[PDB]
Amino acid sequence: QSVLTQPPSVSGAPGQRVTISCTGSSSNIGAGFDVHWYQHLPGKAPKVIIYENSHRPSGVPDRFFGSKSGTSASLSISGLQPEDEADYYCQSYDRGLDWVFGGGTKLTVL
Amino acid sequence: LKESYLEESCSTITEGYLSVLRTGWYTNVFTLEVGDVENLTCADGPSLIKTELDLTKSALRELRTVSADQLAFVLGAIALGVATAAAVTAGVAIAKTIRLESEVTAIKNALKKTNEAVSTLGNGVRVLATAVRELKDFVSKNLTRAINKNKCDIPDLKMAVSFSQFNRRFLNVVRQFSDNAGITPAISLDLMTDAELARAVSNMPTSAGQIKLMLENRAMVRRKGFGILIGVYGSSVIYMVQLPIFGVIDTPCWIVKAAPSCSEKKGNYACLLREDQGWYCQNAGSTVYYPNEKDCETRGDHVFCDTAAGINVAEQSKECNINISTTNYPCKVSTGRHPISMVALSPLGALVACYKGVSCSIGSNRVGIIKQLNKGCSYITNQDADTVTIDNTVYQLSKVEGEQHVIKGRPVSSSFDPVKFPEDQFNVALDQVFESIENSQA
Amino acid sequence: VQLVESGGGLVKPGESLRLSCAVSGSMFSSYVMHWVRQAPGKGLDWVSSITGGGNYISYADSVKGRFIISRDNGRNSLSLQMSSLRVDDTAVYYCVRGLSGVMGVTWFDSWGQGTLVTVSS
């Protein structure tokens, strides 16, 4: 029932590129502000993985790349060592007086 | 509120305020269209309609001459007036961005008849396109049918007075733009109606309570903003305006003031002044210092400081407002051989450090002169007295209530000898003063 | 910067409980704070926002009115009263800090471990 939509059907082999698409509406994203993405591995408290669509904080490898354009936001992940198995979430500030998240997407490596 | 009076540095600190940090600028573009009045002419002699139409013609013609730009360490002095310079630099930069023929034609075909028609630029900035079309509706429905073979002396003066109350907005805005040469110092009630300002506020990209504080404190938000002319294209006059965007809200802030403490013995003076007076606020764990006074303004229990003129400092500066004797942070002071009778004005109370040569006392409105003030670094509150008098100059105290505390301490001026006291210095740290004393004695 | 909270357990539908959160930062009053929740097997969902000191709060529309938020800067503590329950509120709750950017936008970071709350029956 999350208004932010993203396909929870991504997996594959180690090493190659995988892409996550996070899309809303004009009231959701527009062009005033941005999207922030959070990773969540099971068994531990989730942490922020990227903010301001590009600003990697301390403690994250440069394998993770993000972008936003129009209303659509894109994640590119390469070099999949098996430990980066987690759920991924978006956030947005749509004007319905609510801080809505995304639908959540599982990512595993065969 | 909380007031703390430090004796050992002759300083006052006032905390308990709530933060409003002006951080962002929202560009807001307006257009108002007039029509084919350039092909409308009065040739039947003098008339009220003729004179008001000629006033509109002359106003829109002289508006074309304004074409933007030129019509087509001492911490206080370093940041002196830099916030206004940065604001007008950002304004003229975004004005140059939006002063393009393809951009204005695009914004005209984008606005059509939908009022708010938000769009993007070449580099990409939210602009919130809006047209006001009441005078176009009036001229299309009434005025063109009213005018016939250039007969402007019609008997219906109702059309004349309605045209007056309609074009008074355009005449008013062009008269501010003629008075201020395109750079308005504030926003008049004619540039922003309350509904338009609320519409601009609700579309400002920020959180919930940010929008709330934008809403119920809109008057001095209108005071803070300023509008810049862009130009006339087709029959449409297009201008813009910068709205402040308050991003950092509800954080404690404090203001520090000081007066020179002068150790005196046998006609020997040694005065020291804290040079870090001003505003301090917190945001995301970092401390922002505003040394200037014009950039920041109090209202109720809230403060409104500008982050452009502010500087970034550390937490340890706070520890020289408490433990200046044993501090590690060398926050700045100044040295002098002579006292200065400059009066300190706390937001709650006041301080006077007047010395030999003048007279000081306190007074009350209901009774009169209460008592004289002994020589030294003296503090007074609004509860004890109403006004403070030095020689012939009288200062008033605000009646804002709060709670106060005085930190007992031996003044740091008394720990030095005026004989070995060094020459006069500006903006040097206290440890620098101590090591200068040590070097001069050695 | 670590932080802890507690106050949940096996709770019958309807009654009010208190969630007390004991974040220990360098200095507290600078940070807006938020509560989020994690239903088991579903996605995360935002619960509540509170700013620095007790005046500008907001809630999600599903939890409007039923929830009370407060914080004491002197004690360095955070308080939530949770009331008028229905069974689908079973979730793990997180206190999160509000390290902000260059604007009014902020991202949740330095999350707590979480406290589990069951509502149904």
Mutation choice for C interface testing from A1, A29, A97, A98 by most C CBs within 10 A: A98
| Domain boundaries, given as residue ranges, for chain C | 5-117
Indicate whether B259 and B219 sit together in one domain.
no
Indicate whether B194 and B255 sit together in one domain.
no
* Min Cα–Cα distance to chain B from A34, Å: 10
Q: What are phi and psi of C47, to 5 degrees?
A: -110, -60
Using DSSP's 3-state secondary structure scheme, residue B89 falls into helix
Q: A14-109 belongs to which homologous superfamily?
A: Immunoglobulins (2.60.40.10)
Question: Tokens in use for B51?
Answer: 């004179």
- Interchain pair C51, B249: CB under 8 A: yes
Size of interface A-B (CB pairs under 8 A): 15
Indicate whether B40 and B87 sit together in one domain.
yes
- Interchain pair B207, A93: CB under 8 A: yes
Give bridge partners of residue B155 from the DSSP assignment. none
The rounded distance, in Å, linking the Cα atoms of B377 and B390 is: 14
Residue B240 is assigned to a structural domain of this protein: no
> What is the helix (H) or strand (E) element at residue B179, kind and residue range?
helix B157-179
Contact A34, A68 (CB under 8 A): yes
Give bridge partners of residue B227 from the DSSP assignment. B241
Question: Tokens in use for B271?
Answer: 């005065």
Place of tokens 């006059």: B237
The rounded distance, in Å, linking the Cα atoms of A79 and C78 is: 41
Using DSSP's 3-state secondary structure scheme, residue B173 falls into helix
The CATH number for C5-117, chosen from 1.10.510.10, 1.10.10.10, 2.40.50.100, 2.60.40.10, is 2.60.40.10
Indicate whether B151 and B277 sit together in one domain.
no
Q: Return the closest-CA partner of residue A10 out of A1, A20, A2.
A: A20
> What is the helix (H) or strand (E) element at residue B194, kind and residue range?
helix B194-202
The rounded distance, in Å, linking the Cα atoms of A106 and A87 is: 5
**Long-range contacts: B422-428, Cβ < 8 Å, 24+?**
B422/B335, B423/B335, B424/B335, B424/B336, B424/B337, B425/B334, B425/B335, B426/B74, B426/B275, B426/B334, B427/B73, B427/B74, B427/B75, B427/B275, B427/B332, B427/B334, B428/B332, B428/B333, B428/B334, B428/B335
The one-character DSSP state at B139 is I
The rounded distance, in Å, linking the Cα atoms of A89 and A87 is: 7
- Interchain pair C43, A89: CB under 8 A: yes
Question: Tokens in use for C65?
Answer: 């009115």
Neighbours of A1 (CB within 10 A): 8
Question: Tokens in use for B404?
Answer: 């106060």
What is the domain extent for residue B437? Answer: 2-19+249-441
Given in angstroms, what resolution was this structure solved at?
A: 4.1
Q: What are phi and psi of B89, to 5 degrees?
A: -65, -45
Q: What are phi and psi of C105, to 5 degrees?
A: -65, 145
Please indicate if any CB of chain C lies within 8 Å of the CB of A99.
Answer: yes
The pairing of strands B226-233 and B278-283 is unpaired
* Min Cα–Cα distance to chain C from B209, Å: 5
- Interchain pair C103, A100: CB under 8 A: no
Q: Which residues of B touch A32 (CB under 8 A)?
A: 126, 204-205
Place of tokens 């008075």: B179
Secondary structure of chain C in the HEC alphabet? CCCCEECCCECCCCCCEEEEECCCCCCCCCCCEEEEEECCCCCEEEEEEECCCCCCEEECHHHCCCEEEEEECCCCEEEEEECCCCHHHCEEEEEEECCECCCCCECCECCCCCEEEECCC
Give residues with Cβ within 8 angstroms of C24, minimum separation 6: C1, C2, C3, C76
Give residues with Cβ within 8 angstroms of A13, minimum separation 6: A80, A109, A110
Give residues with Cβ within 8 angstroms of A100, minimum separation 6: A2, A3, A4, A28, A91, A92, A94, C46
Contact C109, C3 (CB under 8 A): no
Contact B346, B257 (CB under 8 A): yes
- Interchain pair C46, A96: CB under 8 A: no
The rounded distance, in Å, linking the Cα atoms of B350 and B3 is: 11
Give residues with Cβ within 8 angstroms of B236, minimum separation 6: B31, B32, B33, B34, B108, B131
The rounded distance, in Å, linking the Cα atoms of B399 and B381 is: 9
Looking at the 3D structure of chain B, how many domains does it have?
Answer: 2
* Min Cα–Cα distance to chain A from C43, Å: 6
> What is the helix (H) or strand (E) element at residue B103, kind and residue range?
helix B101-111
The rounded distance, in Å, linking the Cα atoms of C48 and C34 is: 6
Question: Tokens in use for A109?
Answer: 């490596």
Indicate whether B29 and B6 sit together in one domain.
no
What is the maximum span of chain A, computed from C-alpha positions, in angstroms? Answer: 41
Query: C47-71: string of b/e by CB count within 10 Å (b at 16+)?
Result: bbbbbbbeebbbbbeebeeebebeb
The pairing of strands B278-283 and B286-290 is antiparallel
Contact B433, B335 (CB under 8 A): yes
Q: Which residues of C touch B245 (CB under 8 A)?
A: 103-104
Contact B245, B119 (CB under 8 A): no
Contact B281, B305 (CB under 8 A): yes
Contact B319, B350 (CB under 8 A): no
Radius of gyration of chain A (CA): 14
Closest by Cβ to C111, choosing from A45, A101, A103:
A45
* Min Cα–Cα distance to chain C from A27, Å: 15
| Domain boundaries, given as residue ranges, for chain A | 14-109
Provide the sign of the torsion angle of the four alpha carbons B171, B176, B178, B183, taken in this order: negative
The rounded distance, in Å, linking the Cα atoms of B192 and B198 is: 9
Query: In a 10 Å sphere around its CB, with 0-12 CB exposed, 13-18 middle and 19+ buried, how is residue A68 labelled?
Result: middle
Contact A57, A86 (CB under 8 A): no
Query: In a 10 Å sphere around its CB, with 0-12 CB exposed, 13-18 middle and 19+ buried, how is residue A85 labelled?
Result: middle
Closest by Cβ to C45, choosing from A47, A57, A101:
A101
Q: Tell me the residues of C at the B interface, defined by beta carbons under 8 Å apart.
A: 25-27, 29-32, 49, 51-53, 55-58, 99-100, 102-106
Distance from the first to the final alpha carbon of chain B: 47
Q: Which residues of A touch C61 (CB under 8 A)?
A: 96-98
Residues making up chain A, counted from first to last: 110
CA of B328: how far to CAs of B192, B212, B287, B425, B431, in Å? 51, 42, 17, 21, 9
- Interchain pair C111, A96: CB under 8 A: no
The rounded distance, in Å, linking the Cα atoms of B100 and B108 is: 12
For chain A, what is the total number of helices (H) and then of strands (E)?
A: 0, 8
The rounded distance, in Å, linking the Cα atoms of B35 and B289 is: 51
Neighbours of B47 (CB within 10 A): 16
* Min Cα–Cα distance to chain C from A37, Å: 9
Experimentally determined by:
cryo-EM
The one-character DSSP state at A58 is T
The one-character DSSP state at B39 is G
Give residues with Cβ within 8 angstroms of C117, minimum separation 6: C8, C9, C11, C17, C82, C89, C90, C91, C92, C93
Question: Tokens in use for B321?
Answer: 């407002």
Question: Tokens in use for B411?
Answer: 């003044």
Give bridge partners of residue B12 from the DSSP assignment. B5, B257
What is the signed CA dihedral for B320, B325, B329, B330, rounded to 10 degrees? 100
* Min Cα–Cα distance to chain A from C60, Å: 6
